Design a protein around this motif. Structure first.
Motif, PDB file in Angstrom:
ATOM      1  N   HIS A  33      32.878  37.231  36.162  1.00  0.00           N
ATOM      2  CA  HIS A  33      33.563  38.459  36.652  1.00  0.00           C
ATOM      3  C   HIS A  33      33.870  38.340  38.156  1.00  0.00           C
ATOM      4  O   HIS A  33      33.277  37.525  38.885  1.00  0.00           O
ATOM      5  CB  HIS A  33      32.861  39.796  36.273  1.00  0.00           C
ATOM      6  CG  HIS A  33      31.551  40.056  36.931  1.00  0.00           C
ATOM      7  ND1 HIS A  33      30.426  39.320  36.703  1.00  0.00           N
ATOM      8  CD2 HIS A  33      31.168  41.029  37.795  1.00  0.00           C
ATOM      9  CE1 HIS A  33      29.404  39.796  37.396  1.00  0.00           C
ATOM     10  NE2 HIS A  33      29.844  40.804  38.110  1.00  0.00           N
ATOM     11  N   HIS A  35      33.230  39.768  41.097  1.00  0.00           N
ATOM     12  CA  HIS A  35      32.334  40.455  42.003  1.00  0.00           C
ATOM     13  C   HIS A  35      31.822  39.424  43.008  1.00  0.00           C
ATOM     14  O   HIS A  35      31.498  38.296  42.625  1.00  0.00           O
ATOM     15  CB  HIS A  35      31.131  41.193  41.353  1.00  0.00           C
ATOM     16  CG  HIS A  35      31.416  42.588  40.913  1.00  0.00           C
ATOM     17  ND1 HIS A  35      30.555  43.258  40.080  1.00  0.00           N
ATOM     18  CD2 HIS A  35      32.477  43.399  41.080  1.00  0.00           C
ATOM     19  CE1 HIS A  35      31.019  44.465  39.827  1.00  0.00           C
ATOM     20  NE2 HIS A  35      32.194  44.567  40.419  1.00  0.00           N
ATOM     21  N   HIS A  38      29.071  36.773  42.659  1.00  0.00           N
ATOM     22  CA  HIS A  38      29.375  35.735  41.648  1.00  0.00           C
ATOM     23  C   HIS A  38      30.522  34.761  42.010  1.00  0.00           C
ATOM     24  O   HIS A  38      30.450  33.588  41.609  1.00  0.00           O
ATOM     25  CB  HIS A  38      29.566  36.373  40.222  1.00  0.00           C
ATOM     26  CG  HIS A  38      28.396  37.215  39.798  1.00  0.00           C
ATOM     27  ND1 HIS A  38      27.477  36.821  38.848  1.00  0.00           N
ATOM     28  CD2 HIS A  38      27.969  38.423  40.235  1.00  0.00           C
ATOM     29  CE1 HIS A  38      26.542  37.751  38.706  1.00  0.00           C
ATOM     30  NE2 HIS A  38      26.823  38.743  39.538  1.00  0.00           N
ATOM     31  N   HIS A  94      31.199  45.854  31.795  1.00  0.00           N
ATOM     32  CA  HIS A  94      30.797  45.880  33.193  1.00  0.00           C
ATOM     33  C   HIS A  94      32.067  46.414  33.990  1.00  0.00           C
ATOM     34  O   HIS A  94      32.436  47.615  33.838  1.00  0.00           O
ATOM     35  CB  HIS A  94      30.245  44.497  33.603  1.00  0.00           C
ATOM     36  CG  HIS A  94      29.693  44.401  35.028  1.00  0.00           C
ATOM     37  ND1 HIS A  94      28.761  45.285  35.526  1.00  0.00           N
ATOM     38  CD2 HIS A  94      30.010  43.586  36.062  1.00  0.00           C
ATOM     39  CE1 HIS A  94      28.431  44.939  36.753  1.00  0.00           C
ATOM     40  NE2 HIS A  94      29.196  43.936  37.120  1.00  0.00           N
ATOM     41  N   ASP A 116      26.825  39.907  34.284  1.00  0.00           N
ATOM     42  CA  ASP A 116      26.446  41.344  34.473  1.00  0.00           C
ATOM     43  C   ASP A 116      26.981  42.098  33.270  1.00  0.00           C
ATOM     44  O   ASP A 116      28.181  41.934  32.883  1.00  0.00           O
ATOM     45  CB  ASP A 116      27.086  41.877  35.776  1.00  0.00           C
ATOM     46  CG  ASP A 116      26.355  41.443  37.015  1.00  0.00           C
ATOM     47  OD1 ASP A 116      25.269  40.829  36.905  1.00  0.00           O
ATOM     48  OD2 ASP A 116      26.873  41.734  38.125  1.00  0.00           O
TER      49      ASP A 116
HETATM   50 NI    NI Z   1      28.757  42.595  38.892  1.00  0.00          NI
END
Ligand code: NI
Length: 341
Positions: A33, A35, A38, A94, A116
């Motif tokens: 993802h 974010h 990450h 998420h 996540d």
């Molecule tokens: Ni996240």
């Protein structure tokens, strides 16, 4: 150096492992993802294959400038062969574009990486229904019984009703919503929908939202602040100081601000139900902290793992202290004893 709980035994794959330079032996880097914890390390200079969702891929291209030739999007819910290994991407519930990754190892082992996630009973009717998981790499963000919070739907109901009542009492009120990363878009979209307004925002935030494949998006968002009565601001501006400042820029259009600060879990959830929540107020400004979580509650996480029946669990969050590690291992054993696997 890249930790063990980001490597995939018996492949040349990693998961969310972009901040450690060139990883020895990695021929393909998965991203769960978009974010920053990450994606940390990715840029225009990255030159290995990156495998991800289509949405994650639009963000890598347009926001991080990763060159097209290295972006490998995969569809959801579909068996795909990558470098001689069957993989499947599943919706992680998420933020937009977030996935869990199922790996079918050459040796017959089956590994699920959750990235996540917010566990949901609907996941029990995905391609996971079929079959066995030998190792589960679990987002343990809120793995303790004290972590309780309402459903997304209840929090959105609360926000819609609060904003509609205030604007109906006072047609001269402005609604403000704080943001920092992707995720939680439903908060400002649902409010704008009930009030008949577009969401106003900066050029950088508009750009980000345009990568997300939201149907009808051109009809929902704008960079023309003056035509909108729901404004998005960076999260750190959602304080009395920041909001007063903002109100001065609006040119005598508004005589009140109601603002929303989406958070994850806080200690007040121990005691106060969502319906009973109240704002911080100073003059003609009010600020509501609302617990809109995109991670599993304890109860949600426990239900998903007791259904899945994995042979081994490897936590990916709260792994830094002996006490945390110990506490998680104790819960995993209760869950296993109670459910019979
Ligand atoms: Ni996240």
């Amino acid at each position: 150096t890249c930790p063990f709980y980001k490597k995939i035994p018996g492949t040349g794959f990693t998961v969310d492992a972009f901040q450690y330079g060139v990883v020895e032996g990695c021929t393909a880097y998965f991203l769960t993802h978009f974010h920053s914890d990450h994606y940390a390390g990715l840029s225009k200079h990255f030159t290995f294959p990156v495998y991800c969702s289509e949405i994650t891929g639009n963000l890598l291209k347009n926001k991080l400038h990763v060159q097209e030739q290295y972006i490998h999007p995969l569809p959801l819910d579909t068996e795909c062969i990558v470098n001689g290994v069957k993989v499947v991407l599943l919706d992680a519930n998420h933020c937009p574009g977030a996935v869990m990754i199922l790996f079918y190892l050459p040796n017959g082992t089956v590994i699920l990486h959750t990235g996540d996630f917010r566990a949901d009973p609907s996941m029990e009717r995905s391609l996971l229904a079929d079959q066995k998981v030998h190792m589960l790499y679990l987002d343990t963000t809120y793995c303790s019984p004290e972590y309780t919070f309402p459903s997304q739907q209840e929090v959105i109901r609360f926000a819609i009703n609060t904003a509609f009542e205030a604007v109906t009492l006072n047609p001269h009120a402005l609604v403000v919503c704080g943001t920092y990363s992707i995720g939680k878009e439903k908060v400002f979209l649902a409010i704008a929908d009930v009030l008949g307004s577009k969401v106003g925002m900066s050029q950088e935030k508009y750009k980000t939202l345009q990568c997300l494949n939201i149907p009808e998006i051109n009809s929902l968002i704008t960079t023309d602040m003056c035509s909108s009565l729901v404004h998005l601001l960076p999260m750190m501006q959602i304080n009395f100081k920041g909001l007063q400042s903002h109100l001065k820029k609006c040119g005598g259009k508004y005589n009140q601000i109601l603002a929303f600060r989406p958070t994850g879990w806080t200690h007040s959830n121990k005691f106060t139900r969502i319906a009973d929540v109240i704002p911080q107020t100073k003059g003609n400004i009010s600020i509501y902290g609302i617990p809109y979580s995109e991670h599993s509650s304890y109860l949600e996480m426990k239900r998903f793992v007791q259904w899945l029946k994995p042979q081994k669990i490897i936590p990916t969050v709260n792994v830094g202290t002996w006490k945390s590690r110990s506490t998680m291992e104790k819960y995993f054993r209760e869950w296993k004893l109670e459910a019979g696997y």
